[PDB]
Symmetry: C4
Subunit: 82 residues, 4 copies
């Protein structure tokens, strides 16, 4: 898959996760963006996490849609840096 | 491995983890499902975690049976979306 | 690498992590075993973590020696189950 | 990629993460080093995490630059041990 397409896909996941967490869980846009990266990278500090059933369901969807996409994106980035 | 078989295997892991956490740790079905995804994806927020020895042993079994299964499932999903 | 050798290697990592956490951080053998799995699987709930400089250094060594070993072990296990 | 070059790259990531967390978040050099390993390995205990917007942005950069680099480093280490 072309590297630029993978870039767009991961950006779309990032927008999806950030907007979702902001609207469902009520955290700031910046915190929501940070939480999205921490989650799709599988870091999961737990300083932020969903506290509502809708947020829990949403988080499971982000996990499924985002972890693979992020993994493919970082490996493609590797190639351009290295 | 056919994609549909991998789907069934990951669903079975999800049922196993959710029912186990619900019965052993006493969290709701929804929280238990969420915890199972967070755990087998290796996100591990720590908002929920086992507090009993049986729960700790069970969690190690879910980690061993579930992380690989989930990893193979997300990569297969990638292919159908992308 | 033969599957049985990978089994021995991951068991050795598990012994190393469990004994180290027990002696350095003073948690029970059971908690230490659980923490070792949570750590080398990269789940990282954070319900247990090192609180001493020696424990922090030890944890970095376990991360480096254990995460790859566990990853290879789970993928080999996949093959026998599936 | 030669193993020694991957070693240098992961060391550079470690220096970047440790110095950044120390200066931005004000934790000790030792805690900052530990946090960097926990983060780039994707363990993410959450005992330490950024509490400032700059720290959150920095952490996302470390996640993107560091997780892939660490992953390639551990797999190369595997080969020399095993
Ligand atoms: K992989
Ligand atoms: K992880
Ligand atoms: K975590
Ligand atoms: K994690
Ligand atoms: K955590």
């Amino acid at each position: 898959v072309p590297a630029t397409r993978i870039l767009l896909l991961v950006l779309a996941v990032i927008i999806y996760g950030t907007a979702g967490f902001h609207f469902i869980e009520g955290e700031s846009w910046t915190v929501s963006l940070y939480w999205t990266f921490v989650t799709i990278a599988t870091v999961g500090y737990g300083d932020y996490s969903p506290h509502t059933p809708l947020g829990m369901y949403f988080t499971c969807t982000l996990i499924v849609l985002g972890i693979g996409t992020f993994a493919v994106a970082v490996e493609r980035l590797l190639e351009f840096l290295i």
